[PDB]
Amino acid sequence: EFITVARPYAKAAFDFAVEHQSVERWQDMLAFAAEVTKNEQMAELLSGALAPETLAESFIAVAGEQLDENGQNLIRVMAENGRLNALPDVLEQFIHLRAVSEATAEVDVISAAALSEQQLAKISAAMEKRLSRKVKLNAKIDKSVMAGVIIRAGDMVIDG
Amino acid sequence: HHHHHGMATGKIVQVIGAVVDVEFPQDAVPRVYDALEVQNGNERLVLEVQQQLGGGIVRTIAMGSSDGLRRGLDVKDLEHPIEVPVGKATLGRIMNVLGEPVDMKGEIGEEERWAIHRAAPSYEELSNSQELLETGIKVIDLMAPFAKGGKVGLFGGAGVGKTVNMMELIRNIAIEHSGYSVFAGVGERTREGNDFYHEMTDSNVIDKVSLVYGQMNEPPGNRLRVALTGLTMAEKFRDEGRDVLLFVDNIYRYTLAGTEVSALLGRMPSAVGYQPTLAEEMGVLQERITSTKTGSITSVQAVYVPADDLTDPSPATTFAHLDATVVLSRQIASLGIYPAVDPLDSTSRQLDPLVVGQEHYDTARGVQSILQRYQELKDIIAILGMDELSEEDKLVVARARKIQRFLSQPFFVAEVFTGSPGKYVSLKDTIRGFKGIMEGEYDHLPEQAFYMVGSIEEAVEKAKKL
Amino acid sequence: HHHHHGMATGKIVQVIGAVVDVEFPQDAVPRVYDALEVQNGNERLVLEVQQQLGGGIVRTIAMGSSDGLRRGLDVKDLEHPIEVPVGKATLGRIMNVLGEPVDMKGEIGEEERWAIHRAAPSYEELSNSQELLETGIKVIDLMAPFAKGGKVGLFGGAGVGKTVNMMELIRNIAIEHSGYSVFAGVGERTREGNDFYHEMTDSNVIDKVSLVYGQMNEPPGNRLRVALTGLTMAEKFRDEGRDVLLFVDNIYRYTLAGTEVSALLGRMPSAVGYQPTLAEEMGVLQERITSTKTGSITSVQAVYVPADDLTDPSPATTFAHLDATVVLSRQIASLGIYPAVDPLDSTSRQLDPLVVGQEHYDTARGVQSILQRYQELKDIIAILGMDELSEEDKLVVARARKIQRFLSQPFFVAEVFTGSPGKYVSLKDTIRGFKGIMEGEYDHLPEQAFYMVGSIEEAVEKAKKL
Amino acid sequence: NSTEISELIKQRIAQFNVVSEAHNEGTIVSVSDGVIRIHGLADAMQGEMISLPGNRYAIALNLERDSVGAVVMGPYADLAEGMKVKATGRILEVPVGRGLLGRVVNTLGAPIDGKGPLDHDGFSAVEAIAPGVIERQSVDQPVQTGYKAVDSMIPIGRGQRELIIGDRQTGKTALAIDAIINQRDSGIKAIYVAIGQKASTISNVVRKLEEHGALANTIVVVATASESAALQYLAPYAGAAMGEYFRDRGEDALIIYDDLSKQAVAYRQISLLLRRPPGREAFPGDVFYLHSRLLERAARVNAEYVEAFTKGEVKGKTGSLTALPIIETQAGDVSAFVPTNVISITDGQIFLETNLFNAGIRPAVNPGISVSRVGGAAQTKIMKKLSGGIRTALAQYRELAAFSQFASDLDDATRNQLDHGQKVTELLKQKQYAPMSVAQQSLVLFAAERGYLADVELSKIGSFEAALLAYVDRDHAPLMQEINQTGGYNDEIEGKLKGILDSFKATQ
Amino acid sequence: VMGPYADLAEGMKVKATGRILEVPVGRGLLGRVVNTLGAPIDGKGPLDHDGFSAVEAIAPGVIERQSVDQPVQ
Numbered sequence A: 001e002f003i004t005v006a007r008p009y010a011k012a013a014f015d016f017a018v019e020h021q022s023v024e025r026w027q028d029m030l031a032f033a034a035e036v037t038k039n040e041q042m043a044e045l046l047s048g049a050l051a052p053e054t055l056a057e058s059f060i061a062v063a064g065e066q067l068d069e070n071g072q073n074l075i076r077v078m079a080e081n082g083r084l085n086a087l088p089d090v091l092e093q094f095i096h097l098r099a100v101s102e103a104t105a106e107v108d109v110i111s112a113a114a115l116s117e118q119q120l121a122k123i124s125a126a127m128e129k130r131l132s133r134k135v136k137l138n139a140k141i142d143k144s145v146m147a148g149v150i151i152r153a154g155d156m157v158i159d160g
Numbered sequence B, C: 001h002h003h004h005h006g007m008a009t010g011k012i013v014q015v016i017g018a019v020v021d022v023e024f025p026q027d028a029v030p031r032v033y034d035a036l037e038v039q040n041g042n043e044r045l046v047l048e049v050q051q052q053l054g055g056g057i058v059r060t061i062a063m064g065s066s067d068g069l070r071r072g073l074d075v076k077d078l079e080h081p082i083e084v085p086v087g088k089a090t091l092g093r094i095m096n097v098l099g100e101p102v103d104m105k106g107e108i109g110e111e112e113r114w115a116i117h118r119a120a121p122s123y124e125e126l127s128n129s130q131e132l133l134e135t136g137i138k139v140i141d142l143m144a145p146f147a148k149g150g151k152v153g154l155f156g157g158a159g160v161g162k163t164v165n166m167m168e169l170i171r172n173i174a175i176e177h178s179g180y181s182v183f184a185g186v187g188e189r190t191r192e193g194n195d196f197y198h199e200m201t202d203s204n205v206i207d208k209v210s211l212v213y214g215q216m217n218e219p220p221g222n223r224l225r226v227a228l229t230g231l232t233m234a235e236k237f238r239d240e241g242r243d244v245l246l247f248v249d250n251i252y253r254y255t256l257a258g259t260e261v262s263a264l265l266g267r268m269p270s271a272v273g274y275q276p277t278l279a280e281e282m283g284v285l286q287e288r289i290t291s292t293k294t295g296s297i298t299s300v301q302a303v304y305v306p307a308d309d310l311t312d313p314s315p316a317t318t319f320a321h322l323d324a325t326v327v328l329s330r331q332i333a334s335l336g337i338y339p340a341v342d343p344l345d346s347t348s349r350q351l352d353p354l355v356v357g358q359e360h361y362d363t364a365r366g367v368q369s370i371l372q373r374y375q376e377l378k379d380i381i382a383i384l385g386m387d388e389l390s391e392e393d394k395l396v397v398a399r400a401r402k403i404q405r406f407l408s409q410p411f412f413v414a415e416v417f418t419g420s421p422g423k424y425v426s427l428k429d430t431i432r433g434f435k436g437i438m439e440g441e442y443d444h445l446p447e448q449a450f451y452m453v454g455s456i457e458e459a460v461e462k463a464k465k466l
Numbered sequence D: 001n002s003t004e005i006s007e008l009i010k011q012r013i014a015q016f017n018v019v020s021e022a023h024n025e026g027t028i029v030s031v032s033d034g035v036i037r038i039h040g041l042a043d044a045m046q047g048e049m050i051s052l053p054g055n056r057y058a059i060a061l062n063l064e065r066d067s068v069g070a071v072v073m074g075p076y077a078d079l080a081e082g083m084k085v086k087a088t089g090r091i092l093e094v095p096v097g098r099g100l101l102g103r104v105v106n107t108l109g110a111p112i113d114g115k116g117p118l119d120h121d122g123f124s125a126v127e128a129i130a131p132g133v134i135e136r137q138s139v140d141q142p143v144q145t146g147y148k149a150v151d152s153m154i155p156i157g158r159g160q161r162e163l164i165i166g167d168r169q170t171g172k173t174a175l176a177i178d179a180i181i182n183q184r185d186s187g188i189k190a191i192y193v194a195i196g197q198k199a200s201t202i203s204n205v206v207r208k209l210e211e212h213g214a215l216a217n218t219i220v221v222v223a224t225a226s227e228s229a230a231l232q233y234l235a236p237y238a239g240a241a242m243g244e245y246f247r248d249r250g251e252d253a254l255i256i257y258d259d260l261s262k263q264a265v266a267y268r269q270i271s272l273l274l275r276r277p278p279g280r281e282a283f284p285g286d287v288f289y290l291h292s293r294l295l296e297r298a299a300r301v302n303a304e305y306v307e308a309f310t311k312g313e314v315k316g317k318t319g320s321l322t323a324l325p326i327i328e329t330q331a332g333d334v335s336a337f338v339p340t341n342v343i344s345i346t347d348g349q350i351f352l353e354t355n356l357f358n359a360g361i362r363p364a365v366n367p368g369i370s371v372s373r374v375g376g377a378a379q380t381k382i383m384k385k386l387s388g389g390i391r392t393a394l395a396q397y398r399e400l401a402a403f404s405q406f407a408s409d410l411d412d413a414t415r416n417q418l419d420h421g422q423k424v425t426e427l428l429k430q431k432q433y434a435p436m437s438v439a440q441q442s443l444v445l446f447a448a449e450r451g452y453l454a455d456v457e458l459s460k461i462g463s464f465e466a467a468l469l470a471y472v473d474r475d476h477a478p479l480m481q482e483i484n485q486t487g488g489y490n491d492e493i494e495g496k497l498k499g500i501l502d503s504f505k506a507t508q
Numbered sequence E: 001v002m003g004p005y006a007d008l009a010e011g012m013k014v015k016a017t018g019r020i021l022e023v024p025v026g027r028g029l030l031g032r033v034v035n036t037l038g039a040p041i042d043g044k045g046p047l048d049h050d051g052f053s054a055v056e057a058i059a060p061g062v063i064e065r066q067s068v069d070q071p072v073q
Ligand SMILES: Nc1ncnc2c1ncn2[C@@H]1O[C@H](COP(=O)(O)OP(=O)(O)OP(=O)(O)O)[C@@H](O)[C@H]1O
Pocket: D166, D167, D168, D169, D170, D171, D172, D173, D174, D175, D328, D329, D330, D356, D357, D358, D359, D360, D361, D362, D363, D364, D365, D431, D432
């Protein structure tokens, strides 16, 4: 969960992986791995194991070894490191690898969520709300917005 | 010594330190004690596992140094630590601190590869009992009583004839006592140790005790090692019934030694980082030394002064490890008497009032009154003209001249040294001859008559010589 | 500047402290010294790497403060630390502690961006040699000898005319000595520093030494900075052959300064957390100051008293950094003489007995006998009616009145101050005129004749004036 | 740590399986100040001193598994890591044997001789330890202090060890070199190791190397403010070896060193830098483990030694190695752990009062508070025998002076003692740069022994007719060479001295 | 670690009595010699154990306490 060890990971992920294009390919392999630790017996059995060799062994082995050899010999790398203990850190950091690479997004304020990928501000944003259509903001629609301006307002009711 | 057939182990994982960061045959772990004997470069390496820790990865340590080797390795596991040729054959023959044939091959008699681990007996075993002791030192074994099979705190500065009196101990512990008389030392001056080989010829009786020495540059484990194998030895002598009585060198070396020990651990050590259990090691220690069933397990108690510590958890422990208190007089050495040391502060604990009852409550306790007698007779009566002082105070000064001269007595040591024969003394001739004589009887006995003269037949029949 | 073209670096990783938790252009690391000059908000930031540590992540520190910025950053790397315009042009012109044009632009003459790192010479380089020193102070350079190109411990309280005598040093180090006379200070009182600009007009000779000042609120690096650039300066003066002699302010500021230094490190610092190598920095220090080949690298040694420490590892080092011991007399200031300070405790080390041999072993050592002469003549003979005291003791009181008056002498300072001209003095007229005269010759020379009067032609020809 | 790579974890993707970089050179991993985590050099030899890039054989002691940490060889801070390794398994090879003597050394060695081309036998390790306990010579081998009070007070010989503290500003640094003048002729080659010295001290010192002489007798150590723990701290540990040239020739080997504590926090402050445990006073028993190691060494060694020590080449020469501590007197801080420790270690000892150097009495030191193991053990019939009654009598004139002030009227007991001991006490002081002759010692032997000085005993005539004594003595006493040659207490020559002493009354 | 701690390796199958402090109780056992580590001792280790008990004891009721002057000889 340090994710910094996994930072060096996701580093080597875009790096060797995307270099191998395993950023996607071991996005697949990686996916299967988080599936492996996701196995709770494989969690229940996660660490009793002194030999990390035993771990990568029963790991690729158990799970079905969808990891690359970059991830099998890397399975020696992190498994041996035992930093393999934390799967998702560099998984969301790899999601941050390809995704950060691809980043365009949005966040709905005073609205039900948006997340419309906007490479630029207001780019897909004003295009979305303008594009609304939706325009309802349903989650945060009214009480949230009207309590936003009226939030500032009660903030004036600070005068009491 | 043991298996370690098979070379066992494996690498030394992180090569740092004598303790093992080491791959053993990872399943392989012995008792932490149970040794692991590798090849150390050329040398055969060995470490009793310092740690018991799995994966064949545990601390296993030695008194040496590691630079130069590979982290890779394999280390045979000497299934036994502690088992080293041991028994009474060593006597006189030079053992290294390894017991190794220290001298030109000192060949301390190779004996049972014998576990160092010999230790405390049953309540009764080394006898549930009390065993008193004296060898009849001329003025001394008379002076203080003692308990057999043990050790008693020794405080005195210099000019002991400790080697002389040791020859009296040769003349006693070897001679006037039979029980196997062994001794050992560590941390000396090189050619002065060789000069204790000179002295070893002075007594010449060196044959009673194997020569095994530390030479303080010996590392902390090296420095602290020899004892329990010493119990593989009294595992002869006392166990051999020829009562183990072995002379004990160095506490400061041992006190500070256990300090350096628990320090090296990096552990929460004793206070001021000392060996936490060093005292418990004293429980194991006196636990070893008892007038035994087997043979009295006895030890000469003298301490490398742990800086002669104040209140000295050592002397605190060495008090009650002193059945008799001790002092040595440069002043009686200034008196120079054949009794040249400090009777002041030197006597058995319970001797006078009880436990001899009157026997020493009269002869010796009343004798202590006489210590007041020449104490303020010599001292007080010395303050000004003693004409005031009743001649009893001057016959406490013939307690001094006459009686204290009688204290000056030939020595079984001085026989073994100057020829002045000395004896295993009879305190009857003290409790009477010196008590009655020194007090009221034959007060005409000259100092000289008494001086350098043994029991009241030597002092008082030297008063026939006057 | 150096490079630091390119803005280099990157973020300041964890934004805490002037030392860098910082992403540099991670591959980029300079010499830890080798500077990194960023933009600090508006300001251009700079840090010589405090740590050399990889990933462009190393401590890199500055005398300022970080609040307000982002952990994100990029910091240009000034390939050189230490290189700052330096040379002898600065003389008189006000340098900041930055050397910056301290005054209205003090414009200490911009010179070689010059590495601070100027340091020790070869055995022969700055003088494998000994170089003695005196400027001929009226009663003083006569009084004590000195060694050229160096520094000597200064102990004295108050009323020095240290600025006056500095004008005598202007009248000497600038005048009666040519060798480039530079000086610097730090940690003063604000308008009292400005009043040392007033004094800078008093001597008016301020032009010999750039004005560079600390103003003690300067942070610890700020406080401790200026020296080695000072060696980029003597890298003119001494190196300029016009012997670098620069006056040295503050040890307590420096002693405590290095304390605050190694403290900030959090390192095992010197004892009581001081700068561990501050003394080694003294080896680099006197290593800098030598009567040189180049020009005598000399320094006025006076210490911000590191609390005037007792046994003072500073005075311990400042002893042996004192070729001459020092005292200043409020009593000779109570004597108020043109010689107003304490000759007691002030003389060169080896002057009298040898090294002048008799020259001072007679004139000066015998002169010290005369110090006993008015010492117990004035003192002892003062105890009661001196009628007992031979008039020699009263001609040791004409050593006092007459001779000690002769000590009172006009000053090249007092010229530069009160007009009382003073001189580079000739101790011949001491070693003879004042030694013979003060002792036996023209003992009729009045105090006044001698008082406030220079060498025995001024004192004794003022005895022609009487 | 490991994850740092991510590039060699990019490798390790394969290169946790892929592998096999073992070489004497893998990269310096982490460069700060001569401490670099470092790679390759798989198995490397003892502290293997790895000839560094543009830099000395770099030593890493106990193998740091992942990236061996390394030692500053000269410059600590130069650059970034990744050097591979400029590498040698060898540690501890320095020119050995008797070769290079007299021509000055660096901390490197003879090279810092202006010559610098002084060739010892050749590269040797620098360690040494005790001569054979058994194989040891006891060399009474007397020694001449040059300030007589010590010499007669304390004779000694090859093998010796003793403690010393030189007082602040006097007399430590200067100390005894008059003895060295006396020992310009010593003939047992002697050098001193001074820690972290200041140069010109060494320069004009060299003026006294000409003057007193003779630098050629032996070259000496070099250490200055920049001495690394290599230089500084190891220098005492460093100098241990080649004196076996002499010593393990069975020949007499002797050398000096003093005041190393820059070793103590060089190595100890190193331990902090090492992250290694600072012992008491931030330095461990590697004091007594060093004294254990280094300081256990000095002995005259047996014939049995050079039958081995010289390997039967000297076929039983007695390997003679004497050396002595000086921990310069400072601060009054004394036991000082290691110093106490080493106090325990000290065979002989010098308690040395400044106070008389503070009194400027040429004789500064603490009188018998300085206590040597050896002493008149080496002293001769004149020296041992004739010169005996010193220190206690000293305590007399001291103690005899003692009561005088408060309770007064000390008779000619103390007068005729304390003053007689104050007069002779005056005769004691021996100035800096004063060596002392054995015949010159005989002056006290007869004179004091004869009480003969009591004639001239006025320190005026004591010194004066002590000089007429010296002169017409040298006139009247040409045969004294024999005496000077002799160990004295020669009853014939004794009477001879009574007579030439009658001469010594007016003349000598 | 109860008693000797150094014998063997970790991973010995952990054997568990769920009882802290079941120790011979009750007034049966008086006089028969006992170790502190155990009721056994020379000569008779045995004594009349009114049964396994736990030691630790809080103060009795202050309120319910028999204030007792029971004399001292
Ligand atoms: N007892 C003494 N009386 C007079 N002068 C002395 C005495 N001892 C030493 N000196 C003088 O002092 C000098 C010795 O001082 P030295 O150079 O040794 O400083 P130091 O003693 O090393 O001081 P520190 O111990 O602080 O280093 C010699 O030149 C000597 O003339």
